[PDB]
From a paper:
We incubated this complex with nucleosomes containing ten base pair (bp) DNA overhangs on either end of a 601 nucleosome-positioning sequence and a histone octamer containing two modifications: histone H3 mutated to methionine at lysine 27 (H3K27M) and histone H2A monoubiquitinated at lysine 119 (H2AUb). H2AUb is deposited through the activity of another polycomb complex, PRC1, and enhances PRC2 activity in part by interactions with JARID233,34. We incubated PRC2:EZH1 with the modified nucleosomes and generated a cryo-EM map at an overall resolution of ~7 Å. Interestingly, our reconstruction revealed a dimer of two PRC2:EZH1 complexes bound to one nucleosome. We used signal subtraction and focused refinement to improve each component in the map individually and were able to refine the nucleosome to an overall resolution of 3.3 Å, one PRC2:EZH1 monomer to 4.1 Å, and the other monomer to 4.8 Å. The model shows that the two PRC2:EZH1 complexes bind to opposite sides of the nucleosome and engage with DNA near the locations where the histone H3 N-terminal tails emerge from the nucleosome core particle. We observed clear cryo-EM density consistent with the H3 N-terminal tail interacting with the catalytic site of EZH1. In our lower-resolution maps, we can see density for the DNA that becomes fragmented upon focused refinements, suggesting that this DNA is flexible. There are at least three possible reasons why we do not observe density for H2AUb.
Numbering used by the authors:
A (entry chain E): 38 to 133
B (entry chain A): 37 to 135
C (entry chain H), D (entry chain D): 28 to 122
E (entry chain F), F (entry chain B): 24 to 102
G (entry chain G): 14 to 117
H (entry chain C): 13 to 117
Amino acid sequence: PHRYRPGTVALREIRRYQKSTELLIRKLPFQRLVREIAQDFKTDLRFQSSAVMALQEASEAYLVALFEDTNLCAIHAKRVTIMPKDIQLARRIRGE
Amino acid sequence: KPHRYRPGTVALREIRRYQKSTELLIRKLPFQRLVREIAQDFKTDLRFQSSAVMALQEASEAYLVALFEDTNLCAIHAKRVTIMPKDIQLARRIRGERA
Amino acid sequence: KTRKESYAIYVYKVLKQVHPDTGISSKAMSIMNSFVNDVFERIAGEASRLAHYNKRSTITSREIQTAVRLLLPGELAKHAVSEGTKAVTKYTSAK
Amino acid sequence: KTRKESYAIYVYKVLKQVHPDTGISSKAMSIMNSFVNDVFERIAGEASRLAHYNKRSTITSREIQTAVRLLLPGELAKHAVSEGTKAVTKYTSAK
Amino acid sequence: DNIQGITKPAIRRLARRGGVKRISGLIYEETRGVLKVFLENVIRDAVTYTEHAKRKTVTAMDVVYALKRQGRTLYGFGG
Amino acid sequence: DNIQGITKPAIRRLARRGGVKRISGLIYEETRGVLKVFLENVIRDAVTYTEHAKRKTVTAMDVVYALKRQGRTLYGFGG
Amino acid sequence: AKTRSSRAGLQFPVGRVHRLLRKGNYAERVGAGAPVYLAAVLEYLTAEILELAGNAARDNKKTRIIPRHLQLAVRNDEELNKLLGRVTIAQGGVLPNIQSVLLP
Amino acid sequence: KAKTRSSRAGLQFPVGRVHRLLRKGNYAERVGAGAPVYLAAVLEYLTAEILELAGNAARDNKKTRIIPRHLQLAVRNDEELNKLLGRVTIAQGGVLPNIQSVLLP
DNA sequence: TACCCGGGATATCGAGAATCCCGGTGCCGAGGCCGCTCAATTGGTCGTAGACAGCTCTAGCACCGCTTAAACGCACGTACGCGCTGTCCCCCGCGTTTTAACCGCCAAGGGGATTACTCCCTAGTCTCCAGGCACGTGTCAGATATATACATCCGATATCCCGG
DNA sequence: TACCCGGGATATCGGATGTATATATCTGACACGTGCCTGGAGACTAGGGAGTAATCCCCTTGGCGGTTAAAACGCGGGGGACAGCGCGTACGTGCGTTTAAGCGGTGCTAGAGCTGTCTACGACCAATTGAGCGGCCTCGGCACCGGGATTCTCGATATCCCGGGTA
């Protein structure tokens, strides 16, 4: 029964996803979330497909830059585990 | 015996004293010499209004005070109370000022 | 001796209308003047951008209204749009 | 069927003049078109601001030159001002 | 309510793209919160532009103008 | 060379205004570096505006326009 | 000779706002509802900020608003802080903020 | 005698379209002639630099068609193009292959 | 005690899962050709924006003398940074089972966009005049010296508690 | 080996230091009046940007069948985050010494800041034509399936050198 040590598949995935360019969030649940959030601003809103694709591109770019800053906060705290402490520190130093 | 406080009490006393004041903390004349020296490397024989140097000093002090605020939050985040150049570099990197 | 325009007397008028006994220094008057210029430029900028987006060349009250709803955060937008619409009604129905 | 203007053929011409064998996809063409529009708006914005500061109403080559020296970081500014001044000389001394 | 559609593997993939090796368990709800706030800001502005155009369909240009106003310029969708 | 005119007590006062209780010794040179880089960026832009106005005196409006371009709007000096 | 400020019940000048919208090169055409509405908005923001600043001057037992009072008026309100987050007010200083972990 | 100003100025980007965008865009009352020539020159230079670095990164990837990913690498591996486009998201580009040192075994 | 027994850490190899490279095949989007239409160009005409000369008078820069406020340096001690170590629990890899994301195909209609037509709102001119600004003058808000009260905060100490 | 006395952690009040609250003085900066002039306002006209009606066809939404990649659910374990401990070193506090930053003056002059003149450079208008865009097409570069080389991982195993109780 082969089993890797903890850490090796994580680093393998870090490499696989830093080489790839495809969208990581699934398309349809993100679309439902966007329509749900829009609902609380105007009823009966329609959406071009490219509008939801643009929202998804920008949302994923934002969350990836956020996890990069969060990883730098974790490393700064002598840890290899990201924590909600780290996300809150990142957004605070970033000014959000 | 000569009276002496413990480390920390005068620091906090000064924190309160300077968070109440609004005056400029850097002295005026050495900052003016630094501003003229840096300008020299862009164009020779430049003149400056007095309000121009006051504006430079106002913005520079506001910038360094916000920077030390973020640096203190990084230090506290690392379970420390002493700021370090690691902390300044982390602050400036996350703030986007590295380049 | 060129007359430099300012918002100083208008800020002073609104200050007397909100606090009749409190005066104001000249440095705080400079800060209020720069605040007024800044917010002016922000709103007129966003309104010009809105007009360019919609292939229009006329800045009307609708552009300023949507610029205020974009730029002011939340409740400041709600009260200012109300105040602004009030002043345009009083303007369009006056003598 | 309204003709939507673009910079696509001009980007393709400059691509053939810098890499004769490499083509380009349509998504990268969209990204280059948006880059050109963006840098255009940035430079024309800063130039308009410069003209308003100096109480002027004419955007000349000097305003665009100082806008480029403000907006482009360092060596991109040095080479582009040179290239731009070259093209204005060739323009002002042509037949 | 559809915020759970942002699954735990999807947040893990996003973290992998950011270079994160190890992820604690309380991250996922925190991340759902932050993404929810981001889309709130962006879609509000986009809907405002739709309101001003007297239209009922939110175009991609609206989302581009909105992200650009917020200082996050997106290339590849026009404009 | 005049960068030492930014003294150790002045950096300590600035840190006190930021709320810092304890300061390590390597801070001071690091801070001299960061301030030097900040003024470099700002004065370069201000000098550019002076160059464009065909003048020899750097006005306060030049420094205000420069700080504003860099996203740090300063009130109280005109404009 | 009734001015448009008094006609609209306002204090900020509708004529100066209108000629700054004309000279500022924002569009080709500028209506009449636009400078009235914009003067109304500007008057409201000036009113709100000078109100909070007079309050902070009263708390400090003073009858003259200084820069420090504008600083406190802006940074203790949430929406004016969001509005003026990227703005430095000169001669203002900072809020009296001391972190919890530094206290004994 | 219908020689266009693009060819007259020795450039490729259209000086006429740049000039009519400076007029339509409501930037100033008057617009000279040196302004659209100079601005078309600057725009041509930046497009040249970006497509140069992008063809290099496409060649290094053994590809003959520049994709978004290649523009991403071309911009983010250059320092001054990164300073120019620091706050700009390129769609379909991803990120650089960056792994921190402390995470490695 | 010196034993042969026994827990910590090192190099070394070989199975083993994963990934890169290499051919082989299909398919669809990028490059290229053609009509045409509308915007780039050329020629001409005014009007005023800006380059230029001259004058002024404002403030920006060098120069000295006191004056303490603050920077500099040194001793010293203690409090915090950091390394070590021990625990435990939480997250990570992996197998199994569920489930909803995706494709693809089609259908109905909401509204995005385009064109035409009228019409009225603003740009522009001209004339008049009064509100806003520069300038002058008073007066009191507050900055500045001194005098006691009112919180911390640190050491002597008051007493608890083992120990060499 | 029992009494007495030395060290350590945690409440208490004296007492020393800095700090918030009471008067007196003196100022100089804010508030207010005056001349005036230049920008705001009123009136009138032209036209072209914008509102509105009709049309039509694009594309957005809704629904169904399958199928298959991905998400959800649990096992077991190690490895990393979290509480405890000690050292030393390097900062913070206070004291004397001393370096220079501020204040107050005048002198000067370079250069900002206005005024009048005047031409050349750009807006505006009409003709015309060719460059740039919609539509079409074909074909080769990219996507993709499969196999082999390779490339790092990880366990099993032989081997090793330092100190607490077995035979």
